[PDB]
Amino acid sequence: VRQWAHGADLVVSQLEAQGVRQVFGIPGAKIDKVFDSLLDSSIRIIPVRHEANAAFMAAAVGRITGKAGVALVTSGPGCSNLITGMATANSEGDPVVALGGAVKRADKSMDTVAMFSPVTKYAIEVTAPDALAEVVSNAFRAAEQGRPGSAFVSLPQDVVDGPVSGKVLPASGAPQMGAAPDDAIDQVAKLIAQAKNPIFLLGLMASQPENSKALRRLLETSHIPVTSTYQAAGAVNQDNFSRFAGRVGLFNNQAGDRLLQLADLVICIGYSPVEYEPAMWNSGNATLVHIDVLPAYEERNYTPDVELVGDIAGTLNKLAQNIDHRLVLSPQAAEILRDRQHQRELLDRGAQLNQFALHPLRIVRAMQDIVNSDVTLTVDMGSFHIWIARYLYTFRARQVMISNGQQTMGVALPWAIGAWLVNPERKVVSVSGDGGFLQSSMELETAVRLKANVLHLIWVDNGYNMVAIQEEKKYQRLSGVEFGPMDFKAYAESFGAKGFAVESAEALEPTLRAAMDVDGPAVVAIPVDYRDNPLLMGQLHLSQI
Amino acid sequence: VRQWAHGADLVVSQLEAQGVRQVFGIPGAKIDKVFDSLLDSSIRIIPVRHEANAAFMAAAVGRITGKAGVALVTSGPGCSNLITGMATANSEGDPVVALGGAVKRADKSMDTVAMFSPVTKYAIEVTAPDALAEVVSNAFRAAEQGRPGSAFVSLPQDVVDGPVSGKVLPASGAPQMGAAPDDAIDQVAKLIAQAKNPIFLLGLMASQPENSKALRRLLETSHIPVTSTYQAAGAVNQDNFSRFAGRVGLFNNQAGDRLLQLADLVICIGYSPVEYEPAMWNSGNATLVHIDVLPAYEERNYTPDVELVGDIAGTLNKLAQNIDHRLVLSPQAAEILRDRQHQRELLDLNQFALHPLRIVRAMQDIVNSDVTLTVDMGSFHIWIARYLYTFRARQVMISNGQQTMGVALPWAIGAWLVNPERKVVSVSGDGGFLQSSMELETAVRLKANVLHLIWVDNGYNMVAIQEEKKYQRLSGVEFGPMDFKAYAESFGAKGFAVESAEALEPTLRAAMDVDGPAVVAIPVDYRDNPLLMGQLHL
Amino acid sequence: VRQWAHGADLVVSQLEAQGVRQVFGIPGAKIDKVFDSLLDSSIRIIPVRHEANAAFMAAAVGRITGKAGVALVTSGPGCSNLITGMATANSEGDPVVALGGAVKRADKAKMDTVAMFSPVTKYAIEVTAPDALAEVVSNAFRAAEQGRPGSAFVSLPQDVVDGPVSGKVLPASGAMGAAPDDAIDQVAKLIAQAKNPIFLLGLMASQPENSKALRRLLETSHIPVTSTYQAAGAVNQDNFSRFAGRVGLFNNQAGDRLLQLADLVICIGYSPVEYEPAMWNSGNATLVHIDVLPAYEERNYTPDVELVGDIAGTLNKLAQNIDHRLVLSPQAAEILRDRQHQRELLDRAQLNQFALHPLRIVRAMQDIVNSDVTLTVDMGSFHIWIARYLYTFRARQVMISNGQQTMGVALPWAIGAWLVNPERKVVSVSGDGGFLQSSMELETAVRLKANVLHLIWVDNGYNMVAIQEEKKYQRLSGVEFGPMDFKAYAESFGAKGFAVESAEALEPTLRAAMDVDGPAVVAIPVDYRDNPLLMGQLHLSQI
Ligand SMILES: CC1=C(CCOP(=O)(O)OP(=O)(O)O)S[C@@]2([C@H](C)O)Nc3nc(C)ncc3CN12
Ligand SMILES: CC1=C(CCOP(=O)(O)OP(=O)(O)O)S[C@@]2([C@H](C)O)Nc3nc(C)ncc3CN12
Ligand SMILES: CC1=C(CCOP(=O)(O)OP(=O)(O)O)S[C@@]2([C@H](C)O)Nc3nc(C)ncc3CN12
Ligand SMILES: [Mg+2]
Numbered sequence A: 001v002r003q004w005a006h007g008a009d010l011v012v013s014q015l016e017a018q019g020v021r022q023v024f025g026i027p028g029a030k031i032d033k034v035f036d037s038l039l040d041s042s043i044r045i046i047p048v049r050h051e052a053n054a055a056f057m058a059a060a061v062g063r064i065t066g067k068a069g070v071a072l073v074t075s076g077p078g079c080s081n082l083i084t085g086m087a088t089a090n091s092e093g094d095p096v097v098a099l100g101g102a103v104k105r106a107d108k109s110m111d112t113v114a115m116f117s118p119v120t121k122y123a124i125e126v127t128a129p130d131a132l133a134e135v136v137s138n139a140f141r142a143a144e145q146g147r148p149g150s151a152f153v154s155l156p157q158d159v160v161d162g163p164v165s166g167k168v169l170p171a172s173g174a175p176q177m178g179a180a181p182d183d184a185i186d187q188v189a190k191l192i193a194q195a196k197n198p199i200f201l202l203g204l205m206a207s208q209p210e211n212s213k214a215l216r217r218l219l220e221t222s223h224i225p226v227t228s229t230y231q232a233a234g235a236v237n238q239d240n241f242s243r244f245a246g247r248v249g250l251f252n253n254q255a256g257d258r259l260l261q262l263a264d265l266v267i268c269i270g271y272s273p274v275e276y277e278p279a280m281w282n283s284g285n286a287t288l289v290h291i292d293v294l295p296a297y298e299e300r301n302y303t304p305d306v307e308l309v310g311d312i313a314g315t316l317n318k319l320a321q322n323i324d325h326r327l328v329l330s331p332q333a334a335e336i337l338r339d340r341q342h343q344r345e346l347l348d349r350g351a352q353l354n355q356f357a358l359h360p361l362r363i364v365r366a367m368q369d370i371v372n373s374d375v376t377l378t379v380d381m382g383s384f385h386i387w388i389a390r391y392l393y394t395f396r397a398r399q400v401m402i403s404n405g406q407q408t409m410g411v412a413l414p415w416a417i418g419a420w421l422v423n424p425e426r427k428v429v430s431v432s433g434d435g436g437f438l439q440s441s442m443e444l445e446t447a448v449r450l451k452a453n454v455l456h457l458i459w460v461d462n463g464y465n466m467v468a469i470q471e472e473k474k475y476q477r478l479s480g481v482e483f484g485p486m487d488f489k490a491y492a493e494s495f496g497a498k499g500f501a502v503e504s505a506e507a508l509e510p511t512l513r514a515a516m517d518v519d520g521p522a523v524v525a526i527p528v529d530y531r532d533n534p535l536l537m538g539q540l541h542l543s544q545i
Numbered sequence B: 001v002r003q004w005a006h007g008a009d010l011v012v013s014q015l016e017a018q019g020v021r022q023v024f025g026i027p028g029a030k031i032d033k034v035f036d037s038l039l040d041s042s043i044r045i046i047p048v049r050h051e052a053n054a055a056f057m058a059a060a061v062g063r064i065t066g067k068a069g070v071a072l073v074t075s076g077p078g079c080s081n082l083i084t085g086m087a088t089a090n091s092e093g094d095p096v097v098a099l100g101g102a103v104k105r106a107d108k109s110m111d112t113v114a115m116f117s118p119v120t121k122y123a124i125e126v127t128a129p130d131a132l133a134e135v136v137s138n139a140f141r142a143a144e145q146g147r148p149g150s151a152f153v154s155l156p157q158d159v160v161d162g163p164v165s166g167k168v169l170p171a172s173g174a175p176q177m178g179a180a181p182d183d184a185i186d187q188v189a190k191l192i193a194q195a196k197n198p199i200f201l202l203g204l205m206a207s208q209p210e211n212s213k214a215l216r217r218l219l220e221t222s223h224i225p226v227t228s229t230y231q232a233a234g235a236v237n238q239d240n241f242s243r244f245a246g247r248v249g250l251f252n253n254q255a256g257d258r259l260l261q262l263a264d265l266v267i268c269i270g271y272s273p274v275e276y277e278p279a280m281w282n283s284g285n286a287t288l289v290h291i292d293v294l295p296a297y298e299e300r301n302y303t304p305d306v307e308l309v310g311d312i313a314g315t316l317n318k319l320a321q322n323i324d325h326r327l328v329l330s331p332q333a334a335e336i337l338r339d340r341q342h343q344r345e346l347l348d349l350n351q352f353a354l355h356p357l358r359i360v361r362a363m364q365d366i367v368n369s370d371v372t373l374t375v376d377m378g379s380f381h382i383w384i385a386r387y388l389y390t391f392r393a394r395q396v397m398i399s400n401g402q403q404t405m406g407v408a409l410p411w412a413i414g415a416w417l418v419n420p421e422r423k424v425v426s427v428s429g430d431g432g433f434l435q436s437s438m439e440l441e442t443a444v445r446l447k448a449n450v451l452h453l454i455w456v457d458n459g460y461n462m463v464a465i466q467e468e469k470k471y472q473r474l475s476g477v478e479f480g481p482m483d484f485k486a487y488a489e490s491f492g493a494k495g496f497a498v499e500s501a502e503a504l505e506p507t508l509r510a511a512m513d514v515d516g517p518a519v520v521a522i523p524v525d526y527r528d529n530p531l532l533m534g535q536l537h538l
Numbered sequence C: 001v002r003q004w005a006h007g008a009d010l011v012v013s014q015l016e017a018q019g020v021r022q023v024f025g026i027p028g029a030k031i032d033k034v035f036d037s038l039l040d041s042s043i044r045i046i047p048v049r050h051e052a053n054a055a056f057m058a059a060a061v062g063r064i065t066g067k068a069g070v071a072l073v074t075s076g077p078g079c080s081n082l083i084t085g086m087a088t089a090n091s092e093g094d095p096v097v098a099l100g101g102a103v104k105r106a107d108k109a110k111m112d113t114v115a116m117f118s119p120v121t122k123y124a125i126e127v128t129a130p131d132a133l134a135e136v137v138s139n140a141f142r143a144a145e146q147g148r149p150g151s152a153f154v155s156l157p158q159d160v161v162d163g164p165v166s167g168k169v170l171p172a173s174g175a176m177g178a179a180p181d182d183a184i185d186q187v188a189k190l191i192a193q194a195k196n197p198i199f200l201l202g203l204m205a206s207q208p209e210n211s212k213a214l215r216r217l218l219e220t221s222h223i224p225v226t227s228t229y230q231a232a233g234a235v236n237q238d239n240f241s242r243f244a245g246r247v248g249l250f251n252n253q254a255g256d257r258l259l260q261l262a263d264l265v266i267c268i269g270y271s272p273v274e275y276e277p278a279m280w281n282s283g284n285a286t287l288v289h290i291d292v293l294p295a296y297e298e299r300n301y302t303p304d305v306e307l308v309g310d311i312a313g314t315l316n317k318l319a320q321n322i323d324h325r326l327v328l329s330p331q332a333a334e335i336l337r338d339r340q341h342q343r344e345l346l347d348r349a350q351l352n353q354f355a356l357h358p359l360r361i362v363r364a365m366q367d368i369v370n371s372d373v374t375l376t377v378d379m380g381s382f383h384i385w386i387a388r389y390l391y392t393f394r395a396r397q398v399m400i401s402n403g404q405q406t407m408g409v410a411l412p413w414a415i416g417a418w419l420v421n422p423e424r425k426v427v428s429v430s431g432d433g434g435f436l437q438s439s440m441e442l443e444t445a446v447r448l449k450a451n452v453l454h455l456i457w458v459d460n461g462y463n464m465v466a467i468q469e470e471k472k473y474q475r476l477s478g479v480e481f482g483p484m485d486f487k488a489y490a491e492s493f494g495a496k497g498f499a500v501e502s503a504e505a506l507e508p509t510l511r512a513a514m515d516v517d518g519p520a521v522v523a524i525p526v527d528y529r530d531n532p533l534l535m536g537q538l539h540l541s542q543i
């Protein structure tokens, strides 16, 4: 153990032991010592314009690196401004550690710990300087292990400013967890051998890098059909697996659901019912196998017949080793996949789509032209989200951040900035509506300052369309969903970022290509015609719900 | 899936599915439908006299069977009376599911979920009748899996009285993880090789029945020294392992601690820092290996260099299969155990009131491998712990991190119900005896073959001596005397009162022969306590 | 300010400033310094045998004195054992301050007592800084005794009470004035136009600071009065001929009929939690709220006129604005007359069966309970019998209100009540179920030489629960247990024990037990067969 003049120095050392490359936040009196101590560290300080976005950026870092992104804010409003961001990260399973300042212990005030407990996996306040290092260290453990999530640590001003005696705690990382029991694995390998219509249902954990190779090997060896929840949207896609059946949870005409209904054997990997209500795919007819790092969060419509708890990669590798031949699709299974093939042909169409304001399909097509396996795509919440989700099978991004159970608007730009910082040599494209855009557009200054290579696209309709269409379907009239217009091109330029405004369908691709080629932040406003949205909304489960 | 006329019926079916054999509790208006439904069930309804004891009894059932014991109480005071008991169960790792009534949803109020959250692993209220069965099922999952604990389920009256649609969720039981990875086991087997002063620190999980054979197998093939926390007090004892270094956490003269400080390699099995402060034994200079069903609960003095998570039995069996030679003790290692040797020797009285040691010795003579012993909290607890090495009981319930008095008798009753053919001996002081003695009526009614021993000093000695040490004067630790023999007999139990030293052994022998509840008052002289206290961590 | 060697000395000093006469509790390592410091003060240390009872005893002290009773326990189980007791105190409005030990501040990093007590207290806080020690304790008392009284919990970290501290004792506050003149006049105008006015008395109307003023208001207005059980002692059938009984339990009370008939309902010191407004307020009458705190509005409780302030003052002023006594309307007179008929009929003939008939026991109890004695009642079927005949008990005070329906309260309430006025006798009554949950305090009673006579109605079961099950299911579950020799049980403590073996032995046994100067227990076998009749008079049966 070493002698520290400031708890803050210990905190910084603990952060470095974790391998933190940057911290996102806004300084304040109660927490400025930590900001100060970061000056003598290799950790980069990234000032944001609104704390909520520090949490969003941190979530992106966490999702990509598997190591928690870090947010640092002051007491009071500094902390309460993070709540939505922390809840979003926790619901999506993104590892995030937020260190928030607090009044001196003697002065204790806002009970932030009580406030964050509902939307975090871990929330604790350091009430003793000698606990400083372990509390911060355990924050990371909680955020990163098991089903990842967010963690909040409250840091009293006197504890961070005052001296402390203690040693840095080494970052343990992921424990060496055993695979599921061999006899249980052999039992599933046996079920697979006698299965006529098997299918893998992938959940969040299946999309983790740690399970990437294992998953690929298993799919390559068994050639068994795969469907995925939106949390696992990026685990597999139409272009890397011929038997991919799409993502389930949004649309009512997915081959994945048809295959789950036809299934005689369903194997869930890293899946939790929360990702997609079991009450909509599991009849209870097929033999259900649960594979994940934690026991099945058993439910009324989710009671596994065989539970394989343990290291997912380990289990999948062992399963792969006990599979002798590739599956021969039954007539029905093959028919379902052929249907999706035709279904995708119809969705793609060929067509000119030269109308203006632009048709969603024209925008989706132009977006697919600029997003390649070297580009990351982040998607906000709104009607455009549904359109993009409908065509996820045709995006070839290196990675796609779109899953958003809380349906939190404003996430795209911050997510993009966080993602770019992890791999600054690559480009990132973020897309949102005008409503979502204005909730986090203050970060455009941050992007300019960081010279982040991000292209942000705005689908402009001058309203909260996603809400409007639901009001209509239910009440046949609108309320609180329409607002005024804005000159988004001029808006973006006032930040010193490059701005574009699409005034015709013909200018779309050229504009996007130019904005993409810009070496730094760029914003493209795209007027959109949402009148066909009812057609798309007719393909949602909500329609039945 | 079925259509149930009463949510209560589904709750009972789910309980049967869980294999519950009895429920401990006290009925009340809000929850009486569940009690009524149990009438048509194979589940035995066991009325207790105070809810807290329903939690204590359930804990004993859970500890032994690995399946959660069940408490059933009504709303308000019915549930608040369970708090201390649920906290004790959660602290000791005893699987307990408590079902508490609540006012109708429309009427909601006492926030029981909020009250129980701090002392349970799982606390939830059923606000949707269609979630009834799943909420109950998950209560058991949460209480029985990983490191076991207590779970609380709040059941609104309207929810259990009203109709419900659902199916009995099959009992999946705690999922079976696989042993830690082969590469991880090879790494540990290798550290044990590159180690000169290795030692096993056993925690709670190491004592679970599923790990008994694997543990013995690992100890026998490696012959590595072993020390345990009190939660793991029964994992290994002096007579079943030559290199046992005693239980650590109480006395300042234990070999386990010396060996831990000397160690260059410490392998913790089923251990959590809460069982024994790492600050007391881990300097950090020793390579630290963690083996448990769950990741390590790291802290300033507990950061495992190697962390293995998985089925403990499988992990230990495989580890044992990778060890080729028994350990040859180093000079200092043998020296330390040499000292414990002398220590044991020194540990191996007609005054009245009786001397603690006289009582302890008289107790060891009646407690055998067929007898379960439960120990309450008080000075007598320290004495019995000092000589734990010489007790040879079937099982010993003693770990009590919260130092909750009154646990002994109800623990004994719950333990007896699991194996009715055997005898149970419980020991407490007079203070602890009265906090839960109302259950003597329950014992007589059940004809529980339990022998309760009361060390009588007419005070709260364990607190008195701490005050004596610090202030040289006593406060609030002395109370009046009682006729415990008559007290017990008023319940229909057999009572005895040791009036002389010679009468001790004969009285206990006589009481042990009693086929049913029996109580023996034993006057004790605590004047020597200051001496024993000098052996505790200061 | 001042320099203190131990935070504990400041606590004991703060308690003396509050006037605390004694402390109930069980010591432990984390809190023993406080018990030690108490050795040097005038404050008496009263060890109990179970912490729950320390809260029950403190509640009786607080209720009678108006000043918070004090419980002192150690950390962990010491604190969790108080919860039910603190909840019961809060629910009945009894001022109670509990001080629980806690682990050293530095060790608090590994039981969140503050969170566990918050749902059942008015005030729950932990001293996290020795400089806040005295104020936190002072504020605990202020919170418990002011406004509508309740329980307060204070967590004291061991290092804080053991370590030195700087600070001075904070004097006890105490105190509003009468409601506004305009208000009292507006109300008086409503009274002058009311044909069927009625006062509904709540908890605050029974506080001693209003016994005189209420008496005045009633004597000049002669308006009918009905009370919740929390205010059961505010007025009785004897000192006021237009008293309509306690409302909240039975479905045949004149109080309820007058409330439903009223064109003007004036609630004094009343909060909806004392008696569901959905049971008596249709909303037809003009509602006037008078209390030390604003009204706790709800669906069936929205006062058309709301007066907040010193009750005694307001009532004394309103009385001066009362022109003439009320001339009862025919319907009102008829309802009050029916209550008189009901009372005579309820008094029923010769019940000499054994086990004893509830009514025989009730009569015998009314005989020994005199106007000097305090009566405490536990929860169980006997409670309903006693409530039914509350009008015929003429005790100094009656502790019976129990919204939580918590069993085990009688004996400890009695012990606490006796300690406030040791020169008087206290009679406590419970069933065998409630008795065994707190009977460990019989040792405390013997040790204190408490002049308490505890009566046990014996049925060998939880009858109050059993009758509800019988009603709903035609069968019993979990409500029957074995018998006990209660005479020998009590004697084993060193108290006097009795067991009634025949009907004729009842009165002589009670007299003998009453004459005992110290703790006595009498077990009374009861035949609960007639309960269906009585239970049919409960709002519950109509539910
Ligand atoms: C208003 C709104 C969304 C935004 C819609 O507008 P644009 O972002 O302009 O998209 P578009 O649908 O008009 O293209 S999502 C949405 C969502 C439907 O629930 N997410 C929200 N997020 C926050 C933080 N507050 C309120 C909502 C409710 N919903
Ligand atoms: C008073 C007391 C104990 C009991 C001592 O008396 P006996 O049970 O008579 O034992 P002995 O020590 O006199 O033999 S333990 C003890 C413990 C030292 O902390 N456990 C407690 N449990 C509850 C539920 N409340 C308070 C305490 C504080 N401590
Ligand atoms: C069991 C019981 C009561 C006691 C009944 O028995 P006795 O006290 O023997 O009275 P008697 O009715 O048999 O005369 S009250 C009663 C009550 C009806 O709700 N209060 C309780 N208090 C606690 C602390 N736990 C559970 C209950 C549920 N109810
Ligand atoms: Mg919009």
Ligand SMILES: [Mg+2]
Binding pocket: B378, B429, B430, B431, B455, B456, B457, B458, B459, B460, B461
């Ligand atoms: Mg004792």
Ligand SMILES: [Mg+2]
Binding pocket: C380, C431, C432, C433, C457, C458, C459, C460, C461, C462, C463
């Ligand atoms: Mg009874």
